[PDB]
Amino acid sequence: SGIQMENSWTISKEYHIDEEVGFALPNPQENLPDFYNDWMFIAKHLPDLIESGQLRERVEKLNMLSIDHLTDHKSQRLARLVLGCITMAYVWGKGHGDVRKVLPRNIAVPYCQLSKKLELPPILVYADCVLANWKKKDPNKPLTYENMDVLFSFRDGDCSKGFFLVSLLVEIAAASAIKVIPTVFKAMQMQERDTLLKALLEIASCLEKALQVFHQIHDHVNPKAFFSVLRIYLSGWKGNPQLSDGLVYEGFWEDPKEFAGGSAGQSSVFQCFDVLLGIQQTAGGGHAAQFLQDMRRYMPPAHRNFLCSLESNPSVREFVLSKGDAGLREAYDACVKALVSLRSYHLQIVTKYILIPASQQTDLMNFLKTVRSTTEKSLL
Ligand SMILES: C#Cc1ccc(NC(=O)OC[C@]23CN(S(=O)(=O)c4ccc(C(C)(C)C)cc4C)C[C@H]2C[C@H]2C[C@@H]3C2(C)C)cc1
């Protein structure tokens, strides 16, 4: 068993996986210390600052603020979200091609220093704009769309609330499956047929719920706003012809540096359950594996370590198939089916929210088709 345990029931806190919200950051910080009010003002007013053409001049007038007053993980994660949103807005502007190739030192230096501390690249990633970018409206009500808000958006009407929160709610739905993983491995060591079966049925049930949460994206995200507006600010400078050499982080590196924009490969949920169920993805060969491994380096390092530990545990699939046990096989199959359905839905969302709007003004469609078929081929 690779997974380090905090006690007999819970995985080690060193993996930064919360029992209630999973890979998401629990109860995120909403305010920085007063010392950083100037950064908070800009991130909170990004929509009207971009729209009025005021954003860049405001960032250029900022004083240099040291990150030493960011003493705990939560305030460092908030600061990274604040500075990442400001960076995306500074670089892309209004999204018409008037790009900035130099990030000013009063942002670049604290952002790069903070990113070094957190071992995350100096660009907005999933762990910022989804996993840390949320609050409850009422502390005493549950985690539902109606009771939640994001902390930051880029433009009014960009649907970032719907896109980020629905994604967050899928992560939270998966958390109820992630917290069962130690029980799976314990039942395997102990030969507890029923415990393993109930654990797998629980996982499958939570993955099914996650897909029902995913369905909500159509109700909160307009495809034209997403494609023509939000995607601009999730774009990066790796292989981007508008920033062919990357971005200059003034006062941190002399040469421009390339970092990739957002990708679905930054969520740990898919790989977590592919590993658990022994599904090896092959679609797209080395170039796709290289890209996906690169996106794993854009997850929090503790979540990378969790995924690596999972790969070093005994195999659920090998255990199950050897039992002549219809019940274990059916429960395993229910998990695989729920993962196949999630991949299938992911493909249809890419189609409606990227491939189709793009057509109006191929390797991706065939990658997502192959990942779904590899998964379905893992049905025992
Ligand atoms: C910075 C940053 C940044 C901002 C957002 C993301 N989003 C992301 O990784 O979401 C993971 C998803 C997959 N989508 S998605 O709608 O197919 C989706 C997700 C991302 C995009 C991009 C524009 C970033 C390419 C496009 C689409 C269509 C939502 C979410 C729900 C289910 C399927 C997995 C999930 C299991 C949790 C990543 C980086």
Q: What is the 3-state secondary structure (H, E, C) of 245-301?
A: CCEEECCCCCCCECCCCCCHHHCCHHHHHHHHCCCCCCCCHHHHHHHHHHHHCCCCH
Identify the bridge partners of residue 11 per DSSP, sorted by sequence position.
5
Residue 22: what are its φ and ψ, rounded to 5°? 70, -130
CA dihedral 163, 169, 170, 173 (to 10 degrees): 180
The residue to which tokens 């429960």 are assigned: 331
Q: Which two tokens stand for residue 189?
A: 């060591």
Breaks in the chain listed by the residue before each, with C–N > 2.5 Å: 361
Binding residues: 346
Write the single-letter amino acid at 32: L
Q: Strand locations in 163-256, DSSP E?
A: 248-249
User: Residue 375: in which H helix or E strand, if any?
Assistant: helix 363-377
Task: With CA atoms as reference, report the closest residue to 181 among 273, 278, 304.
Answer: 273
Three-class SS state of 27:
coil
Specify the pairing of strand 135-136 against strand 148-149: antiparallel
Residue 379: what are its φ and ψ, rounded to 5°? -65, 130
Q: Which two tokens stand for residue 290?
A: 């290289």
Give, using CA atoms, the residue closest to atom 16 of ligand 1: 349
Q: How far is Cα 231 from Cα 124, in angstroms, rounded to an integer?
A: 12
Q: How far is Cα 229 from Cα 234, in angstroms, rounded to an integer?
A: 9
The domain segmentation of the chain, as residue ranges, is: 13-377
- Counting DSSP H helices and E strands in the chain, the numbers are 19, 4
The architecture of the domain spanning 13-377 is Up-down Bundle (1.20)
The residue to which tokens 């109700």 are assigned: 219
Q: What is the resolution of this structure in A?
A: 1.9
Q: How far is Cα 333 from Cα 215, in angstroms, rounded to an integer?
A: 22
Rama region for 250: left / alpha / beta (φ>0; ψ in -120 to 50; rest): beta
Ligand 1 pocket residues where CB is under 6 Å: 124-126, 129-130, 167, 170-171, 214, 231, 234, 262-264, 266-267, 269-270, 346, 349-350, 353-354
Ligand 1 atom at minimal distance to the Cα of residue 264 = 9
